[PDB]
Protein backbone atom coordinates (compact mmCIF):
# COMPACT_ATOMS: atom_id res chain seq x y z
CA UNK A 1 0.00 0.00 0.00
CA UNK A 2 1.15 3.65 -0.53
CA UNK A 3 4.16 4.85 -2.87
CA UNK A 4 7.13 7.55 -2.61
CA UNK A 5 5.44 10.32 -4.09
CA UNK A 6 6.07 13.40 -1.70
CA UNK A 7 4.36 16.66 -0.70
CA UNK A 8 4.44 19.88 -1.87
CA UNK A 9 1.88 21.67 0.11
CA UNK A 10 1.65 21.05 3.98
CA UNK A 11 2.16 17.42 5.06
CA UNK A 12 -1.60 17.88 4.99
CA UNK A 13 -2.08 14.93 3.50
CA UNK A 14 -2.23 11.29 3.95
CA UNK A 15 -2.59 8.96 0.90
CA UNK A 16 -1.65 9.03 -3.03
CA UNK A 17 -2.36 6.51 -4.73
CA UNK A 18 -1.30 6.85 -8.55
CA UNK A 19 -0.92 4.21 -11.18
CA UNK A 20 3.15 3.52 -11.54
CA UNK A 21 5.36 2.96 -8.15
CA UNK A 22 4.41 0.98 -5.03
CA UNK A 23 6.94 2.12 -2.38
CA UNK A 24 10.51 3.38 -2.44
CA UNK A 25 10.94 1.19 -5.76
CA UNK A 26 11.52 2.17 -9.41
CA UNK A 27 9.04 2.05 -11.59
CA UNK A 28 8.85 2.94 -15.12
CA UNK A 29 5.89 3.87 -17.60
CA UNK A 30 3.79 0.87 -19.03
CA UNK A 31 3.08 2.34 -22.08
CA UNK A 32 -0.59 3.61 -22.94
CA UNK A 33 -0.84 7.25 -20.94
CA UNK A 34 -3.96 7.40 -18.30
CA UNK A 35 -3.39 10.11 -15.55
CA UNK A 36 -5.23 8.61 -12.67
CA UNK A 37 -4.33 10.36 -9.18
CA UNK A 38 -6.45 9.82 -5.97
CA UNK A 39 -5.66 10.94 -2.44
CA UNK A 40 -7.20 11.98 0.73
CA UNK A 41 -5.85 14.49 3.16
CA UNK A 42 -7.91 15.89 6.14
CA UNK A 43 -8.65 19.78 5.44
CA UNK A 44 -7.49 22.42 7.92
CA UNK A 45 -9.93 24.89 8.47
CA UNK A 46 -13.32 25.86 6.14
CA UNK A 47 -13.89 25.99 2.95
CA UNK A 48 -17.06 26.01 0.06
CA UNK A 49 -14.69 24.86 -2.56
CA UNK A 50 -11.43 22.81 -3.28
CA UNK A 51 -10.03 22.87 -6.90
CA UNK A 52 -7.43 20.33 -8.50
CA UNK A 53 -4.78 20.92 -10.64
CA UNK A 54 -2.42 18.76 -12.11
CA UNK A 55 1.14 20.02 -13.04
CA UNK A 56 3.10 17.60 -15.32
CA UNK A 57 6.86 18.14 -16.49
CA UNK A 58 6.85 15.36 -19.55
CA UNK A 59 9.90 14.96 -21.62
CA UNK A 60 9.87 18.98 -22.14
CA UNK A 61 5.54 18.26 -23.23
CA UNK A 62 4.77 19.55 -19.56
CA UNK A 63 0.91 19.91 -19.90
CA UNK A 64 -0.99 22.69 -18.61
CA UNK A 65 -4.95 21.74 -18.19
CA UNK A 66 -6.68 19.93 -16.02
CA UNK A 67 -8.04 16.65 -17.04
CA UNK A 68 -11.44 16.18 -14.95
CA UNK A 69 -12.86 17.96 -12.27
CA UNK A 70 -11.46 19.48 -9.60
CA UNK A 71 -14.36 20.95 -7.43
CA UNK A 72 -15.87 18.09 -5.85
CA UNK A 73 -17.81 20.76 -4.23
CA UNK A 74 -20.36 19.63 -6.39
CA UNK A 75 -20.14 16.44 -5.61
CA UNK A 76 -20.25 16.34 -1.54
CA UNK A 77 -21.66 18.49 1.61
CA UNK A 78 -20.13 21.92 0.68
CA UNK A 79 -18.59 23.72 2.34
CA UNK A 80 -16.28 21.69 4.14
CA UNK A 81 -15.64 21.99 7.06
CA UNK A 82 -11.86 21.70 9.15
CA UNK A 83 -11.17 18.04 10.52
CA UNK A 84 -13.01 16.56 8.18
CA UNK A 85 -11.50 14.02 5.74
CA UNK A 86 -11.53 15.17 2.16
CA UNK A 87 -10.21 13.54 -0.90
CA UNK A 88 -10.05 14.39 -4.50
CA UNK A 89 -9.43 12.37 -7.61
CA UNK A 90 -8.27 12.52 -11.99
CA UNK A 91 -8.55 10.20 -14.58
CA UNK A 92 -7.93 11.45 -17.54
CA UNK A 93 -7.17 8.51 -20.59
CA UNK A 94 -4.02 10.27 -23.19
CA UNK A 95 -2.48 8.64 -26.11
CA UNK A 96 -0.94 5.45 -25.30
CA UNK A 97 3.07 6.40 -26.47
CA UNK A 98 2.71 10.45 -26.27
CA UNK A 99 5.53 11.05 -23.91
CA UNK A 100 8.60 9.80 -23.78
CA UNK A 101 9.47 7.24 -21.03
CA UNK A 102 12.70 9.37 -19.67
CA UNK A 103 11.70 12.43 -17.78
CA UNK A 104 8.18 13.03 -16.63
CA UNK A 105 7.23 14.79 -12.90
CA UNK A 106 3.68 14.90 -12.02
CA UNK A 107 2.64 17.25 -9.16
CA UNK A 108 -1.06 17.78 -8.56
CA UNK A 109 -2.16 19.93 -6.00
CA UNK A 110 -6.39 20.31 -4.61
CA UNK A 111 -6.72 24.28 -4.17
CA UNK A 112 -9.82 24.66 -1.11
CA UNK A 113 -11.61 27.90 -0.81
CA UNK A 114 -8.59 29.82 0.63
CA UNK A 115 -5.85 28.43 -1.89
CA UNK A 116 -4.37 25.27 -1.26
CA UNK A 117 -5.57 21.76 0.73
CA UNK A 118 -3.51 18.32 -0.57
CA UNK A 119 -0.66 18.10 -2.80
CA UNK A 120 1.14 15.48 -3.97
CA UNK A 121 4.26 14.67 -6.49
CA UNK A 122 5.63 11.73 -8.33
CA UNK A 123 7.85 10.30 -11.04
CA UNK A 124 9.48 7.21 -11.33
CA UNK A 125 8.73 6.66 -14.95
CA UNK A 126 11.49 6.72 -17.62
CA UNK A 127 13.27 4.37 -20.06
CA UNK A 128 16.36 2.85 -20.19
CA UNK A 129 18.07 -0.63 -21.01
Known sequence: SQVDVKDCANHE?????????????????????????EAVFEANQNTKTA???????????????????PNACHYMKCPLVKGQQYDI??????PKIAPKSENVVVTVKVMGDDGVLACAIATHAKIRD
Open 13 to 37: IKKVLVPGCHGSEPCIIHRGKPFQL
Open 51 to 69: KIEIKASIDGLEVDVPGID
Open 89 to 94: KYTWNV
